[PDB]
């Protein structure tokens with residue numbers, strides 16, 4: 014209780030002493046090795062080898078543990094690559110350093126060490142220090158469960174598993190890029206600020222551009238811009254970046270990372286194949302196996318995902334459903350309301366059926382699953398099905414009961430797109446706050462001619478969860494949006 | 498004039514006919530080669546070789562030119578990789594296709610072709626088509642100078658040089674990532690929406706989070722978050738993404754791409770070296786040479802950048818300056834005002850001197866140049882110089898008379914950081930609308946201990962300009978913010 018306030022006072026006082034001696038915060042020590050490198054190269058060597066090799070190295074990091082035993086001490090130093098042992102002895106260091114400096118430092122302090130590699134009696138790799146310095150005085154001791162999110166730096170210092178999660182996120186993004194580029198896709202950057210938001214249905218964030226006296230929107234999706242690029246001739250493009258949806262912070266984050274990709278002369282079937290390869294590749298290359306453990310489940314990304322139509326999923330998860338009800342507006346509305354769905358005045362049959370699917374099946378799609386036949390009403394940007402114009406060549410895919418991706422054969426029929434935008438404008442007029450805005454320039458782009466194309470959006474944060482056994486999106490986002 | 502309205506009517510009518518025949522917009526044709534691949538592999542082969550090799554391929558793209566000559570025609574097809582010639586003959590295609598379909602198509606139409614490779618009498622690589630299809634009817638004919646920005650898709654269809662510019666941008670970003678990762682840097686993602694904006698000085702964009710009834714800011718820089726990651730132990734991190742500054746759209750874009758990188762146990766000198774290697778590497782790997790032509794200049798990224806202190810730059814570009822004036826507030830204010838700078842009440846000597854440097858020297862820094870010794874007043878996040886506390890270990894670097902990067906040894910002195918934040922709060926109270934907000938959590942992070950570190954921000958859009966001979970930032974941003 015009070016012992017903490019003493020740690021603080023003690024560290025301040027030690028800092029005051031440093032200031033009196035000269036420059037309290039230097040920037041001069043240079044390391045030439047991180048712990049992981051030392052382990053990779055030297056863990057397999059016994060003390061006899063290291064003795065003859067006589068390898069001197071320099072490391073730096075946070076002093077995590079210290080056991081002072083008179084004339085000698087043992088320190089665990091934690092850097093970007095993990096931890097390495099330091100053997101700190103009075104007579105190995107320059108005169109006075111051990112007793113007048115080292116012993117006065119505190120756990121949490123950033124230190125630098127140079128010395129010779131060897132192995133302890135316990136067989137651990139260690140550095141027999143010949144030089145040791147205090148680089149940064151830590152004014153605070155080493156560290157609900159919200160603290161992890163409000164002070165992620167404390168989470169990263171303390172928890173090896175949190176660190177590994179974020180290192181894996183970076184490995185996954187790099188591997189996605191490598192996967193995409195190998196398939197001839199080119200990464201592009203489209204606006205975050207848009208005059209007309211689109212490419213999805215969501216309440217947007219609005220901001221005022223002080224200069225051009227205009228109201229701008231943070232993007233809910235880059236879709237309409239990416240398809241303009243395909244019209245332009247960039248027939249294989251992808252973008253990995255944020256979308257912003259003014260929903261709630263219900264562990265949901267207002268901003269999240271999405272990858273969208275478009276490939277001309279392909280349909281949704283090609284996206285299905287690409288999705289399966291991507292997951293199999295990521296699992297194999299990043300995790301070492303195609304069988305991934307997530308909670309109480311195992312996902313085999315080496316086997317094809319399940320494929321069901323939206324109606325098959327509804328029937329499978331609410332077997333008592335009279336499927337004929339989904340063909341009649343009144344019946345579908347009644348069914349929807351009976352399962353707790355508030356049916357808005359603007360909704361049509363296709364929207365109601367989709368909402369029923371969400372309520373009924375989504376949570377149960379645990380194993381990787383593609384759900385096809387999304388109604389036209391809820392897919393204003395998707396190609397109509399040749400046989401039944403009321404459904405589109407669109408799928409969403411789910412893993413662990415969450416939506417991971419959304420893909421479709423793109424609507425390249427400009428006149429149809431205009432009509433569908435108009436319907437969305439009518440829906441907003443009828444109360445649909447999330448309906449799409451009419452985008453004339455986008456229609457114009459389609460009039461110049463969009464090649465037949467397939468596009469896919471994949472929630473990167475959700476994907477990261479599945480590969481790191483995280484069960485809240487907040488565990489894979491470095492700095493989650495936190496309530497004040 | 499009226500001939501355009503006829504093109505439109507004609508294309509609509511042809512589309513109407515397509516609709517009557519069946520599905521006007523199919524998604525079925527699959528290609529197996531792009532033009533660039535065909536050229537790479539087959540340009541060096543003469544007609545004798547191609548005749549015996551008898552290689553059949555499938556391509557698809559926009560019909561750019563067509564010369565109909567009775568029973569045979571020549572078409573230029575433009576895809577993602579460039580252009581390839583098609584030889585379209587009545588008797589080579591299935592019955593009726595040539596006369597009843599092909600001849601009725603229009604330039605701009607997206608078409609698919611399968612056929613055998615050969616070389617024309619002119620020595621050009623061409624495809625003797627055996628199958629040809631209309632994939633997408635173009636309802637509009639092929640395309641101030643603002644149109645390029647308002648309809649970038651038209652710019653990309655029409656101008657090979659615009660395309661190449663954006664292909665190079667993507668190559669540069671990929672090469673930057675490859676350069677960074679090779680040096681042990683890990684790419685991370687920090688928030689675009691922040692409760693407290695910081696890491697730079699600029700008027701921000703504000704947006705309301707409908708849910709959490711809170712006002713949020715689009716980030717002006719990710720700096721404060723990235724340094725929290727270094728405290729956390731991610732000692733080599735970088736982020737490449739947008740910043741948003743509510744300035745003007747004076748060809749300046751409200752949102753732009755920046756790379757920020759941080760490396761612990763390094764100072765600004767290491768950033769200088771990294772900057773030089775990065776540019777030399779990018780030029781060599783992407784452009785094929787270290788000597789880069791930009792406008793009327795040539796930049797040799799194979800030779801060290803020039804290095805001048807801020808004062809040396811002022812003296813060099815306004816030689817008549819009595820340098821002693823920069824040591825006296827009144828004198829400096831008078832000097833500043835005499836060159837047209839409006840000196841605000843909140844400004845101190847360091848700010849005035851920096852403003853003088855901007856007015857006097859910035860535009861003249863054509864050859865790659867580092868400018869050191871930035872005053873403390875204008876560098877609230879930078880490490881103080883050991884000898885003179887009123888300047889910081891900070892530099893900015895310029896090329897082509899524009900600021901390309903900003904880097905410094907990081908301030909890891911928590912108590913100093915708090916004081917400097919307080920000064921920034923005072924500056925805002927005194928009228929500085931762009932002054933930094935006090936960030937308590939950031940100070941707390943520094944109290945846990947930030948290793949000595951060097952950080953650098955590089956304007957990616959400006960960098961792209963220098964490598965593509967573009968002279969407005971709008972030429973390297975796919976969809977520039979355009980006035981309504």
Ligand SMILES: N[C@@H](CCCC[NH3+])C(=O)O
Nearest residue numbers: 212213234236419468470
């Ligand atoms: N824009 C979609 C992803 C791409 C769908 C195919 N065009 C979304 O935000 O869900």
Ligand SMILES: N[C@@H](CCCC[NH3+])C(=O)O
Nearest residue numbers: 696697718720903952954
């Ligand atoms: N945050 C700086 C770049 C990094 C400077 C070094 N910490 C900027 O926006 O200019």
